[PDB]
């Protein structure tokens, strides 16, 4: 929700299109279990570069405020503000439901 | 009573013998919504009783439950401050319903074999005078007629 916390996660999004764009397929060939008995340790051992880099370290956050919890993949917003948008008229096909 | 009048809630009658009051015995022995296996508890107790008795399975069912059917029971009503144990006379609609509740419990409170023998045993034990089924008819009569003075006659 803070401009210091959203920024810390925006720096985790910038290296996703640098390290995980092309050189991720370089380690994805040997981290998995191959059908053959010869599985190399050399690349799984020297796997030191992804310190701050990880695809699982990414949290979606709200696009208006920025809180880590209750994020829906379709909208991208959190349950408090996602509500304020549909209670007005800011999203098409977000009417009242029965069942 | 005046606002909203409902008579009774009834389902489909007895399989092939055709009876609506005997269909309440399959509905009370009903465990968690299995009417398919509840049929195997009543109809197998009809198949195993013909060797123990002589006449039709509908007759021995009615001639035995008359010893389990009560005439008067106690209800808790308060008036003035003290809780009175006033006995109200039970009719034929609630009396036939109270008879199959104590025959249900007496069958389950006898861990012998299967429910096909447990219900068949408490069916003939009501005619001679044995089991926990016939004992509850004489036990409710100990609570009643002893507190006869709390209720006036009709």
């Amino acid at each position: 929700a803070r401009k210091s916390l959203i920024q810390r996660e925006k720096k985790r999004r910038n290296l996703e299109q640098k390290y995980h764009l092309i050189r991720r397929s370089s380690k994805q060939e040997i981290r998995k279990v191959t059908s053959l008995s010869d599985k190399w340790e050399i690349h799984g051992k020297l796997q030191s570069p992804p310190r701050n880099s990880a695809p699982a370290r990414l949290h979606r956050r709200c696009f208006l405020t920025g809180r880590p919890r209750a994020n829906i993949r379709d909208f991208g917003l959190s349950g408090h503000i996602l509500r304020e948008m549909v209670h007005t008229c800011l999203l098409p096909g977000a009417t009242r439901s029965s069942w | 009573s005046r606002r909203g009048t409902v008579e009774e809630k009834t389902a489909k009658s007895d399989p092939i013998y055709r009876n609506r009051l005997v269909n309440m015995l399959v509905n009370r022995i009903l465990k968690h919504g299995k009417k398919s296996l509840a049929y195997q508890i009543l109809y197998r107790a009809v198949k195993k009783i013909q060797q123990k008795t002589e006449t039709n399975p509908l007759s021995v069912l009615r001639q035995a439950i008359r010893g389990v059917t009560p005439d008067i029971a106690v209800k808790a009503r308060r008036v003035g401050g003290s809780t009175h144990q006033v006995p109200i006379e039970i009719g034929s609609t609630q009396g036939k319903a109270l008879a199959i509740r104590w025959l249900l419990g007496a069958a389950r409170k006898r861990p012998g074999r299967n429910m096909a023998f447990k219900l068949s045993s408490e069916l003939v034990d009501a005619a001679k005078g044995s089991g926990d089924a016939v004992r509850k008819k004489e036990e409710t009569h100990r609570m009643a007629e002893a507190n006869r003075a709390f209720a006036h006659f009709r």
Binding site: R31, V33, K39, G44, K45, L46, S48 | -
Partner: protein, 92 residues
């Protein structure tokens, strides 16, 4: 006891490199470590590894009976019943 082991046991680069530099002619036992997600490799025999738990570094000995362990299960996370120094009691 069986954890998350496939083929790669995962031992940190700052763990083995500092031990292979000490396995030249065998010298020095005391070594400081922060990573508790690392696995014990058979060349850690005789070397006293001081592992972090949040509070301080606890000097633990490594033998031949401890191969498939993580060094983190050796260092106590919190204070329960085990081996610890008797603290000076103040006012009740």
């Amino acid at each position: 006891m069986t954890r998350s082991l496939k083929k790669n046991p995962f031992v940190a680069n700052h763990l083995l490199r500092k031990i292979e530099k000490l396995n030249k002619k065998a010298e020095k036992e005391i070594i400081v470590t922060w990573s508790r997600a690392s696995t014990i490799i058979p060349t850690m025999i005789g070397h006293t590894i001081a592992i972090h738990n949040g509070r301080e570094h606890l000097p633990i000995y490594i033998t031949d009976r401890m191969v498939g362990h993580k060094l983190g299960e050796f260092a106590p996370t919190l204070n329960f019943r085990g081996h610890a120094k008797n603290d000076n009691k103040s006012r009740r």
